Amino acid sequence: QDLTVKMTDLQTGKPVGTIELSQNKYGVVFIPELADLTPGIHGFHIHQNGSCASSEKDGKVVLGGAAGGHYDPEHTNKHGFPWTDDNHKGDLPALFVSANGLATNPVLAPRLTLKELKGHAIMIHAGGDNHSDMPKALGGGGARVACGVIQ
Amino acid sequence: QDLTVKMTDLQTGKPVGTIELSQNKYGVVFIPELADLTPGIHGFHIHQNGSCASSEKDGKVVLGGAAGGHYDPEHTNKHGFPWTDDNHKGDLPALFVSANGLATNPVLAPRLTLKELKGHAIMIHAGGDNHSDMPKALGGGGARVACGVIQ
Ligand SMILES: [Cu+2]
Ligand SMILES: [Cu+2]
Ligand SMILES: [Zn+2]
Ligand SMILES: [Zn+2]
């Protein structure tokens, strides 16, 4: 264990739980303890800016848009797998949400370190993540439903 | 990519798809392409013996029991996480099965290598995997539903 990240639903504004971040010899483990999520597989990524506030795009509101794009320190400008290097370092494996709307399945990011995560935002999307920009950009994650700033 | 493992349902005996095994700098990636599985999270582990045949335990039939216990080359005799060392090296992250009964979400095992996998069995269980022997042994995976021998 190490860091505790408070997550909040963007649409409702109410807290949905926390995610514990820990560093180990194989990378960063994300241990979720969230509730009230839509059952299924969800896009899960680290974003650039440390904010969950809404942004604005061509006259339309973007929930959690202030977080910016996917954390991409090497400027790959591509969405990929958590085990591939030529893509966003913030690409995490998808988060599993069971029928009861709970997310407790831990996940690991081999290309990340805890230290570099400080000041960034953890994002959970409505759609899944096929780890590619096609047929849909950013793995088809779609809108941002839950978000939290890494302290 | 590298190896293709044919998976078959133990109860029905009919094929359920394949799992592609590939080696990369971070470990072994398991890319599933399975169908006809019960929606939800499933225990996913590498077992000792290279057989999916049934075994016998105190007069009761054990589907896929010929596969033996979880691959544990260091004899830890404990069930754990894919990123912890003091437990079965065959402990993989859980497999996600969507509502449509399909399993396509790729998963990685940082403690494994392709070469050592040859001759072992890939197992999918009915229950999930909380990566511990409690409250239920072997992460609560329960019975074995799908199995395949690594060539
Ligand atoms: Cu994202
Ligand atoms: Cu098993
Ligand atoms: Zn990305
Ligand atoms: Zn095990």
Q: What is the spatial distance between Cα A81 and Cα A89, in angstroms, rounded to a whole number?
A: 9
| Closest by Cα among A106, A42, A38, A124 to B94 | A106
A120's tokens: 């960034």
Q: Method used for this model?
A: X-ray
Full set of structural domains in chain A with CATH: 1-151 (2.60.40.200)
A 1-40 → B contacts, CB under 8 A: 24-27, 29, 39-40
Rounded to whole angstroms, the maximal C-alpha distance in chain A is 45
Q: What is the spatial distance between Cα A21 and Cα A8, in angstroms, rounded to a whole number?
A: 16
> Among partner residues A24, A83, A98, which is closest to B40 by beta-carbon distance?
A98
Residue holding tokens 């099965």? Answer: B97
In the Cβ-directed half-sphere of B100, how many Cα atoms lie within 13 Å?
Answer: 7
- The total of other beta-carbon atoms located within 10 Å of residue B95's CB is 26
| Closest by Cα among A104, A80, A105 to A91 | A80
Could you tell me the distance, in angstroms and rounded to a whole number, from the CA of residue A128 to the centre of ligand 3? 12
Residue numbers after which chain A breaks, C to N beyond 2.5 angstroms: none
Strand blocks (E) in chain B:
3-9, 15-24, 27-34, 40-42, 44-47, 55-57, 60-62, 95-97, 107-109, 121-125, 144-149
In this structure, are residues A78 and A86 in contact, taking their beta carbons and an 8 Å threshold? yes
Query: Three-state DSSP class for A43?
Result: coil
Q: Do A83 and B108 touch (CB under 8 A)?
A: yes
**Substitution target from B29, B86, B97, B105 for chain A, most A beta carbons within 10 A:** B105
In this structure, are residues A140 and A147 in contact, taking their beta carbons and an 8 Å threshold? no
Q: Is A151 on the interface with B (CB under 8 A)?
A: no
Is there a cis peptide before residue A135, judged by omega within 30 degrees of 0? yes
Q: Do A110 and B82 touch (CB under 8 A)?
A: no
Residue in chain A nearest B30 by alpha carbon: A83
In this structure, are residues B56 and B32 in contact, taking their beta carbons and an 8 Å threshold? no
Q: What is the spatial distance between Cα A10 and Cα A7, in angstroms, rounded to a whole number?
A: 9
Query: Three-state DSSP class for B57?
Result: strand
In this structure, are residues A129 and A106 in contact, taking their beta carbons and an 8 Å threshold? no
CA distances from B33 to A12, A29, A40, B52, B101 (A): 36, 25, 17, 19, 11
Terminal C-alpha separation, chain B: 14
In the Cβ-directed half-sphere of A102, how many Cα atoms lie within 13 Å?
Answer: 7
Residue holding tokens 């709307």? Answer: A101
Write out chain B residues lying below 8 Å of A111, CB-based: 26
In this structure, are residues B129 and B41 in contact, taking their beta carbons and an 8 Å threshold? yes
Could you tell me the distance, in angstroms and rounded to a whole number, from the CA of residue A138 to the centre of ligand 4? 33
- Residue A77 makes CB contacts below 8 A (sequence gap 6+) with none
Resolution (A): 2.0
Q: Do A83 and B29 touch (CB under 8 A)?
A: yes
Q: Is A89 on the interface with B (CB under 8 A)?
A: no
